[PDB]
Design a protein around this ligand. Structure first.
Ligand SMILES: Cc1cc(Br)c([O-])c(-c2cc3cc(C(N)=[NH2+])ccc3[nH]2)c1
Ligand SMILES: [Ca+2]
Length: 223
């Protein structure tokens, strides 16, 4: 997260860290045995870390559970990142409490102007890599479809939305991928891509979760 602030330990209880010997993507806990992340974060050997704040120190509240399966959306396209969503089932259910809790899926899509909270342990520099030890937060508004499409002509599908600042300086970045975009207490986006990080006129692009709620429910129900 570039231009964001320290969230404060466990203030984002649905945030998870996907770890393969190091933190590589974020995710959101939606029930005690399932997490939603981005299909481009897929790999084998994933351990899900819940109740995390400082990813390099065990401080208490952490729960490390291995992933039993990862279900990448069948129509995920790695070249356009259309349908960039993935579900991870946990080997055992997490213990939910106030530090580890699930987030609700939306009932309707959000409108431009809605303010949302984006969080993650991704890069904090737009020019160079600087990965933090504690969780960072950023409040960003969803942009209108014309501004999103004028920013990425021909690269936005109806399963994506832009959120951020066209003036630059505040944005999600590499390492934040798979993580949550929460608006009005509902999971509305998944950090997906952008051109560079916090660059002027190049806002972040997020997977539009309201378009996948029936898919998530049917898939969890059959697995
Ligand atoms: C090289 C590389 C590898 C992975 Br995997 C990423 O997720 C990314 C990535 C870039 C990137 C940029 C943004 C943004 N809002 N500007 C958000 C997520 C991102 N993820 C970059
Ligand atoms: Ca820790």
């Amino acid at each position: 997260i570039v231009g964001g602030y320290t969230c404060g330990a466990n203030t984002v209880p649905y945030q998870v860290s996907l770890n393969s010997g190091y933190h590589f993507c974020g995710g959101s806990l939606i029930n005690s045995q399932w997490v939603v992340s981005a299909a481009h974060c897929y790999k084998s050997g994933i351990q899900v870390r819940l109740g995390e704040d400082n990813i390099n120190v065990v401080e208490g509240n952490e729960q490390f559970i291995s992933a039993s399966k990862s279900i990448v959306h069948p129509s995920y396209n790695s070249n356009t990142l259309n349908n960039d969503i993935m579900l991870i089932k946990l080997k055992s259910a997490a213990s939910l409490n106030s530090r580890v809790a699930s987030i609700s899926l939306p009932t309707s899509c959000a409108s431009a102007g809605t303010q949302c909270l984006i969080s993650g342990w991704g890069n904090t520099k737009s020019s160079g890599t600087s990965y933090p030890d504690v969780l960072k937060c950023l409040k960003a508004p969803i942009l209108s479809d014309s501004s999103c499409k004028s920013a990425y002509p021909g690269q936005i599908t109806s399963n994506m939305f832009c959120a951020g600042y066209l003036e630059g300086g505040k944005d999600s970045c590499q390492g934040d991928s798979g993580g949550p975009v929460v608006c009005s207490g509902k999971l509305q986006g998944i950090v997906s891509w952008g051109s560079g990080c916090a660059q002027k006129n190049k806002p972040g692009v997020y997977t539009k979760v309201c378009n996948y709620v029936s898919w998530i429910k049917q898939t969890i129900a059959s697995n």
